[PDB]
Amino acid sequence: AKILCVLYDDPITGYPKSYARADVPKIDHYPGGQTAPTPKQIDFTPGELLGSVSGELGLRKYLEGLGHTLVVTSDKEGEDSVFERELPDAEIVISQPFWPAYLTPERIAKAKKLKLAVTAGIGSDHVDLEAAIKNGITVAEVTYSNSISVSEHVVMMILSLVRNYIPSYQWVIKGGWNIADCVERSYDLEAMHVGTVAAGRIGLAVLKRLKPFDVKLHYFARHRLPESVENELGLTYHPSVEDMVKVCDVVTINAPLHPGTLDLFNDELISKMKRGAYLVNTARGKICNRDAVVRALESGQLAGYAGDVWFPQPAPKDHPWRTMPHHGMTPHISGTSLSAQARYAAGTREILECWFEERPIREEYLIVDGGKLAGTGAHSYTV
Amino acid sequence: AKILCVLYDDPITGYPKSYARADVPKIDHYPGGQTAPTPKQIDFTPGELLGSVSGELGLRKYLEGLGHTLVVTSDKEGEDSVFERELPDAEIVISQPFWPAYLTPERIAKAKKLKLAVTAGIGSDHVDLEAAIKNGITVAEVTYSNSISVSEHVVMMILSLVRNYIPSYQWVIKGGWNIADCVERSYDLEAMHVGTVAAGRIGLAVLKRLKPFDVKLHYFARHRLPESVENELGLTYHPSVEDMVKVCDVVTINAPLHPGTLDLFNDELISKMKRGAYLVNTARGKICNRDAVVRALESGQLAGYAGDVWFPQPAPKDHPWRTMPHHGMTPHISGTSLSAQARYAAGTREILECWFEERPIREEYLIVDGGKLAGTGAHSYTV
Ligand SMILES: NC(=O)c1ccc[n+]([C@@H]2O[C@H](COP(=O)([O-])OP(=O)(O)OC[C@H]3O[C@@H](n4cnc5c(N)ncnc54)[C@H](OP(=O)(O)O)[C@@H]3O)[C@@H](O)[C@H]2O)c1
Ligand SMILES: NC(=O)c1ccc[n+]([C@@H]2O[C@H](COP(=O)([O-])OP(=O)(O)OC[C@H]3O[C@@H](n4cnc5c(N)ncnc54)[C@H](OP(=O)(O)O)[C@@H]3O)[C@@H](O)[C@H]2O)c1
């Protein structure tokens, strides 16, 4: 069979010859009990670059050893690309949210042999789940593989916005000192009200990391968390997102992208936030209305916005989020740290070993199965 | 009855006429029980810029009402400055560590009327304690006033170094995407070994904030924390700093500057750290040997360095910490966030009110009193 795998490019300085450290911590389980991926073996050392074209997610020796073909490419847009040319023959498509091979209904139509679509990572919104359902296509992602990695990115970005990190760093590069310029917009996070849109694998991990900062914790979700967990953390629940953002100094978005959350943060919901609120979105770009964020930062309604997710991906050189004021953006990198890569690459292989051995894919990896939202998809997703 | 106050300059864009937010949270006491400053009143709203020349720590109206004169300037370097010209006449000298009026022995001999030296902030290493001891000069500082603010700054910088935050942000501004360039040096903090030098007010707050990141926590100190505290946080105690740094992926410095800590992180100690370790120093610049940090980064013995403290302060344009590779520095700002300012300005007034009404200054504020180390100075420094 043919496996089509879309990865981002190697560094512009070439595939790395060395890394800054010698290894990465071994991670055996996730908070709440889910085990680390269980492939029969791995053909990489955890810590190496696996998400780029030359890394190949460490799949080539295994897949070719079973006689299948593996096409790895980064070239993913247009009828002319390696991706779309090879798509009609692929039994399996793999890509990462960081450089995603969008599986629109047109591409799924052209994909005559496509049976399995794997998200090397978390969040399968780049696949058209409705069209995947109409074609008997199993959709699967490596659940939890980088949820912790994002929570660190979230707390790092909250602190950078509130304490005014990046402009102060720029004063160091500029050769200045300029204390008053740095701190005329620099605050402590302590005793601020911080709320999260969703309290899932990421959102809960964020809430735990924020607790010893002595913030006042809030959250909004379709389902309420267990009342014990609310009490051990000091949570206040809000059945309405508008209710939360009205009392919150800082807001983190940690929900998946689907019709229920698309454009959730428009000019109207943002205009309901406290003046000078901080908004962090490591979930998906479209959950925040792009020009609304830009406008609210110009007026001082938002005192800062930071995140790593954009729309589309890659973001074009002129995308207005690059130049809007008071931001702390990165590209889509939080879920593809080298530590996270070792996990979802191992999970991708685990899914592949299950597919070619006719074993069930882990119920918690499943988003679509047999023409239905299933598994995690039934519980986190809407179509 | 002359008070000599050295503060940093107003912003170059002018003293602020508005702020990004309406208020700041009311900080009530510090962890462990110490009360917030208790001046009889304050002449500012918590949240205003107090540490610049126009802020005057909010002391003019108070001090002039009592018939004293308040002289405020930022000009502080050398024999030939407003500070040294006004010194022979001042009974009280106040400065902040962020823009510090060095009370060297030579200047203390000239300060013919000086009886009180107040640190508007924490850390009085800019005052030559030995000379102040000989000349019977009381030295005080607003203990705990910004310890929590620093612990936030530390966790922010740990995450930024490890996750490669700032170079990734740069790719956003340069118009790129460059996922593999961002993440070929990007790791998760989860399950790494993190150690703190000292576990006082800052170090303990650093440790509590790190605990939910699921790191393995280490600490070195001249004296052990209580067993109950070690057990609840998961700490490993090390009797020497060499013993700690050899197993630590990340090291935070949170000890005062005094003979026991001067030049502690020199070439020899740094070469005992793990290859690719991260070093964070929000304590005082001189605890790290300046050029030893640079060489260790240039060679990759340290994967990154971050801190807000320098020697001297302000740091000159050509200071090598500005241009060394893999750094995430700020100027000396963590202790002078607007939230922190409101507390040590309140506390500075409290120390002055006690002085003028002949009531004792708080024992925990005291560093030098009655010709020897006193109060906290007896506990944390040496000479
Ligand atoms: N590199 C990155 O930046 C990165 C990495 C991984 C993931 N992500 C994004 O983050 C998303 C969540 O990650 P995760 O690990 O936490 O997955 P998860 O375990 O399924 O958590 C998602 C939670 O969102 C809740 N929620 C769902 N729909 C909602 C809605 N319409 N309104 C409010 N809340 C809603 C769901 O709970 P309820 O049913 O109780 O509402 C769910 O618990 C992912 O789907 C992905 O899009 C980004
Ligand atoms: N804006 C900023 O960046 C900022 C702000 C505030 C403070 N600081 C710096 O951070 C320092 C500490 O602040 P803090 O609030 O935590 O004061 P603190 O409460 O007195 O804590 C200092 C601790 O250092 C310990 N220690 C002392 N000497 C040591 C040594 N030779 N080796 C190892 N550990 C030693 C002491 O404990 P043991 O007796 O057990 O050793 C003490 O508990 C301050 O002195 C200041 O220089 C920086």
Coordinates of C-alpha atoms and ligand atoms in Angstrom, one line a residue, chain A residues 97-98 121-125 141 143-150 153 197-204 220-225 241 253-262 264 281-284 287 308-309 332-336 376 379-382, ligand 1:
Chain A
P97 CA -1.4 20.4 12.3
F98 CA 1.8 22.5 12.2
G121 CA -0.5 15.4 16.7
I122 CA -3.8 16.6 18.1
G123 CA -6.8 18.3 16.4
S124 CA -8.1 17.0 13.1
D125 CA -9.9 20.1 11.9
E141 CA -5.0 11.5 16.0
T143 CA -4.6 12.1 21.7
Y144 CA -2.7 13.7 24.6
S145 CA 0.7 13.4 22.8
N146 CA 1.4 17.1 23.2
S147 CA -1.4 18.5 25.5
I148 CA 1.1 19.0 28.3
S149 CA 3.5 20.8 25.9
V150 CA 0.9 23.3 25.0
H153 CA 3.4 27.3 26.1
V197 CA -12.4 28.3 27.5
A198 CA -12.6 24.4 27.9
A199 CA -11.0 22.3 30.7
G200 CA -9.8 19.2 28.7
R201 CA -6.4 17.6 28.5
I202 CA -4.8 21.0 27.8
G203 CA -7.2 23.3 29.7
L204 CA -6.9 21.2 32.9
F220 CA -16.3 27.7 30.7
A221 CA -17.3 24.4 29.1
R222 CA -20.3 22.5 27.7
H223 CA -19.9 19.9 30.5
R224 CA -19.1 20.8 34.1
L225 CA -16.1 19.3 35.7
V241 CA -18.5 32.2 27.8
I253 CA -8.7 29.3 24.7
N254 CA -8.1 25.5 24.8
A255 CA -11.1 24.1 22.8
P256 CA -11.0 22.2 19.5
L257 CA -12.1 23.9 16.3
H258 CA -15.5 22.9 15.0
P259 CA -18.8 24.7 14.2
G260 CA -19.5 25.2 17.9
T261 CA -16.3 27.2 18.4
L262 CA -15.6 28.7 14.9
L264 CA -16.4 32.2 18.9
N281 CA -5.1 31.2 22.0
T282 CA -3.0 28.1 21.4
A283 CA -6.1 26.2 20.2
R284 CA -6.8 27.1 16.6
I287 CA -11.7 30.4 17.0
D308 CA 0.9 30.0 18.1
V309 CA -2.0 29.1 15.9
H332 CA 2.7 26.9 15.2
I333 CA 5.4 25.3 17.3
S334 CA 4.0 24.4 20.8
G335 CA 2.8 21.0 19.9
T336 CA 5.9 20.2 18.0
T376 CA -12.6 11.3 21.1
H379 CA -16.8 13.8 22.9
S380 CA -14.9 16.8 21.7
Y381 CA -16.1 17.4 18.2
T382 CA -19.1 18.7 16.3
Ligands
LIG1 N1 0.4 22.9 18.9 C1 -0.8 23.4 19.4 O1 -0.9 24.6 19.6 C2 -1.9 22.4 19.8 C3 -1.6 21.1 20.2 C4 -2.5 20.2 20.5 C5 -3.9 20.7 20.5 N2 -4.2 21.9 20.1 C6 -5.6 22.3 20.1 O2 -6.1 22.3 21.3 C7 -7.5 21.5 21.2 C8 -7.8 20.9 22.5 O3 -6.7 20.1 22.9 P1 -6.9 18.9 24.0 O4 -5.7 18.1 24.2 O5 -7.3 19.5 25.3 O6 -8.1 17.9 23.5 P2 -9.4 17.4 24.5 O7 -8.8 16.5 25.6 O8 -10.5 16.7 23.7 O9 -10.0 18.8 25.2 C9 -10.9 19.5 24.4 C10 -12.0 20.0 25.3 O10 -12.8 21.1 24.5 C11 -14.2 21.0 25.2 N3 -15.2 21.8 24.4 C12 -15.4 21.1 23.3 N4 -16.3 21.8 22.5 C13 -16.5 23.0 23.1 C14 -17.3 24.1 22.9 N5 -18.1 24.1 21.6 N6 -17.3 25.1 23.7 C15 -16.6 25.1 24.9 N7 -15.9 24.0 25.2 C16 -15.8 23.0 24.3 C17 -14.4 19.7 25.3 O11 -15.0 19.5 26.6 P3 -16.6 19.6 26.8 O12 -17.4 18.6 26.0 O13 -16.9 19.3 28.3 O14 -17.1 21.0 26.5 C18 -12.9 19.1 25.5 O15 -12.8 18.6 26.9 C19 -7.2 20.5 20.3 O16 -8.5 20.0 19.7 C20 -6.4 21.3 19.2 O17 -7.3 22.0 18.4 C21 -3.2 22.8 19.8

